[PDB]
Amino acid sequence: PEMVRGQVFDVGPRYTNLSYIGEYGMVCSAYDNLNKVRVAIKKISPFEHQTYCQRTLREIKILLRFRHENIIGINDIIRAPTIEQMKDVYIVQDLMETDLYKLLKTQHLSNDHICYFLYQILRGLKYIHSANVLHRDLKPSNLLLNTTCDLKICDFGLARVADPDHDHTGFLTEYVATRWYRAPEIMLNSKGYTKSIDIWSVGCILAEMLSNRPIFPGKHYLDQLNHILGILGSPSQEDLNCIINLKARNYLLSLPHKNKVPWNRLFPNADSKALDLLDKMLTFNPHKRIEVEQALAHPYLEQYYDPSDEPIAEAPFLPKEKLKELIFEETARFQP
Ligand SMILES: N=[N+]=NC[C@H]1O[C@@H](n2c(SCC(=O)O)nc3c(N)ncnc32)[C@H](O)[C@@H]1O
């Protein structure tokens, strides 16, 4: 068995000549002796913590059912032949050169690249929502790119089925997804069970593609909202009246009036069409926030918009021991 930086990689014999990439998991590249190409392989060791088992089952179940050019596929899954012997799971994927988080650390994107990246994000997200699934953790590091700038959404560990009938909750309720990309209703009255929470994160991603800096880099839970309101300004009477929870409404009413900051003042080099779509994704009221199919038809994406080339899903959509059993069952098709 080949090893890489301490831990081992029981991926032989089909996958050889491993190389570290990054890091209860770990990712390396490997040579696929069957297909004669180098691939990506991530090792997952989740079975002692149930929250890890949850993320693993969600990711595997969803990605095995999804097939889309802008969503990372699972080509293979390696694991022990029995439940007792299964400690680790290996997910094999197409090899990508980088991700958008790493690329934004050092590279200035041209408007052509920004436009092409955004189109691909929304084309993939269109498929996800057509399956009645919410990603719930979209961010630059979950967008993979290869050497010809093909983009694929990855990491579905927090994804769930949309449930807008049960989205309402109290003020300041606990949340899991990545802070800088959370919509304002998360901190006020929403469990994040509707499609609008993904669109907000994509808006945050567009803004970050425009300046190589996160637009709302909150340092803690409620600080996230202060950042969002410092740029969007105070919510209108109509948006406030849609918030019936008294604690959340009275918090917003307790704030001093704040003016909206113009997008063209924040991003003076940006294309005006990109800023118009930005505004519609980063809308405060989630019922007014643009949807993914509307975003694809925005003039900014006119060079690429082709609804017959933007396919949708055919088939839309517990303790540690059952989850490990279900992961074993879900991966049996690649045995062996
Ligand atoms: N895990 N982790 N972090 C370590 C590193 O993995 C990198 N990476 C992932 S990570 C997918 C996921 O997050 O599920 N997939 C791939 C892939 N197909 N090809 C190349 N690189 C990948 C990601 O760029 C980060 O640098």
Q: Tell which residue, 83, 109, 142, has the closest CA to residue 274.
A: 109
User: Looking at ligand 1, which atom is closest to the CA of residue 152?
Assistant: 18
Question: Residue 52 phi/psi, 5° resolution?
Answer: -70, -45
DSSP state for residue 71 in the 8-state scheme: B
CA 198 to chain centre: 8
Nearest atom within ligand 1 for CA of residue 142: 13
Q: Which of 280, 263, 281 is nearest to 272 (CA)?
A: 263
The DSSP output letter for 168 is B
- Candidates 137, 165, 279, 306; catalytic one: 137
Known binding residue 69? Answer is no
How remote is the CA of residue 183 from the centroid of ligand 1, in Å? 25
CB neighbour burial string for 171-200, b if at least 16 within 10 angstroms, e if fewer: bbeebebbbbbbbbbbbbbbbbbbbbbbbb
Could you tell me if 194 and 164 are in contact, meaning their C-beta atoms sit under 8 angstroms apart?
yes
> Which residue CA neighbors atom 9 of ligand 1 most closely?
27
CATH class label, 96-317: mainly alpha
Edge-to-edge strand list for the sheet holding 143-145? 98-99, 143-145, 151-153
Q: Is 325 annotated as a binding residue?
A: no
Identical fold for domains 1-95+318-336 and 96-317, yes or no, is no
Asked if residues 145 and 168 have their Cβ atoms less than 8 Å apart, the reply is no
3-state SS assignment for residue 13: coil
CA–CA separation, 300 and 305 (whole Å): 9
Architecture of the structural domain at 1-95+318-336: 2-Layer Sandwich (3.30)
* Ligand 1 pocket mutation, candidates 4, 19, 21, criterion most atoms within 8 A of CB: 21
The alpha carbon of 27 and the centre of ligand 1 are apart by a number of angstroms equal to: 6
Contacts of 267 (CB under 8 A, 6+ apart): 207, 210, 211, 275
Atom of ligand 1 nearest to the CA of 101: 24
Q: Hey, where are the domains in the chain?
A: 1-95+318-336, 96-317
- 69 Cα–ligand 1 center, Å: 17
Q: Which residues line ligand 1 (CB under 6 A)?
A: 21-23, 25, 27, 40, 42, 93, 95-96, 99, 144, 154-155
Ligand 1 centroid distance, CA of 142 (Å): 8
Terminal CA-CA length for the chain: 17
**Residue 174 marked as a ligand binder:** no
- SS (HEC) of 275-320: HHHHHHHCCCCCCCCCCHHHHHCCHHHCCCCCHHHCCCCCCCCCCH
Q: Cα of 272 to ligand 1 centre, how many Å?
A: 33
Residue nearest to atom 8 of ligand 1 (CA): 27
Tokens representing 203 are 């808006």
Atom in ligand 1 nearest the alpha carbon of residue 155: 14
**How many alpha carbons fall within 13 Å on the CB side of residue 334?**
19
Cβ neighbour number for residue 65 with a 10 Å cutoff: 14
Please indicate if the annotation marks 21 as binding a ligand.
yes
Position in ligand 1 atom list of the atom nearest CA 25: 1
State the residue for tokens 């307790």: 254
Q: What is the CA radius of gyration of the chain?
A: 21
Q: Any known ligand binding at 23?
A: yes
* Atom 22 (ligand 1) nearest CA: 96
> Is residue 251 a contact partner of residue 171, using CB atoms and an 8 Å limit?
yes
CA–centroid distance, 297 to ligand 1, in Å, is 31
Complete DSSP assignment for 108-151? PPPHHHHHHHHHHHHHHHHHHHHTTEE-----GGGEEE-TT--E
Mutate to test the pocket of ligand 1, among 7, 26, 27, 97 (most ligand atoms within 8 A of CB): 27
DSSP percent split of the chain into helix, strand, coil, nearest 5: 40, 15, 45
Closest residue by Cα to residue 78 from 103, 51, 58, 60: 60
Q: Using what technique was this structure determined?
A: X-ray
Q: How many CB atoms lie within 10 A of CB 54?
A: 16
User: Do 191 and 182 contact (CB within 8 A), yes or no?
Assistant: no
For the question of residue 76 being annotated catalytic, the response is no
CB count in 10 Å sphere of residue 146 = 13
Positive or negative, the Cα torsion across 182, 66, 99, 281?
negative
